């Protein structure tokens, strides 16, 4: 169930490449600046668009 | 949970000369945000006093 498994499933399964994806991913950074006002924070985590 | 009884057993510990102690407790929940309450809301689990 790790991510890991996904892609080495196929190895031994497929030995052919997958990719599988999750937003949050391995890329991990941010620049931008907002201005809202007292947002439940429960949104972190949580995609906006 | 949390006990002012519980609590006050170590304060009494502390010296052997203190003949007595007691206090007044606020639960104190600091809020992150203030304009918008969390659309939930915050709650104490523990009912309040009016005012």
């Known amino acids: 169930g790790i991510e890991a498994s996904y892609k080495f499933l196929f190895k031994v399964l497929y030995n052919e ?7 949050s ?3 991990t950074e941010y620049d931008i600046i907002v201005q809202s006002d007292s947002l439940t924070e429960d949104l972190v985590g949580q995609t906006i668009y | ?6 609590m006050l057993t170590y304060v ?5 000369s203190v003949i ?3 206090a007044t407790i606020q639960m104190v929940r600091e809020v992150q945000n203030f304009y918008k309450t969390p659309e939930a809301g915050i ?3 523990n009912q309040i006093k009016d005012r």
């Open chain 2, 20 to 22: 007595g102690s007691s």
């Open chain 2, 1 to 6: 949970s949390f006990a002012k009884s519980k």
């Open chain 1, 17 to 23: 490449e997958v990719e599988i994806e999750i937003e």
């Open chain 2, 12 to 16: 009494d510990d502390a010296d052997h």
């Open chain 1, 25 to 27: 991913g391995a890329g």
């Open chain 2, 43 to 45: 709650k104490y689990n």
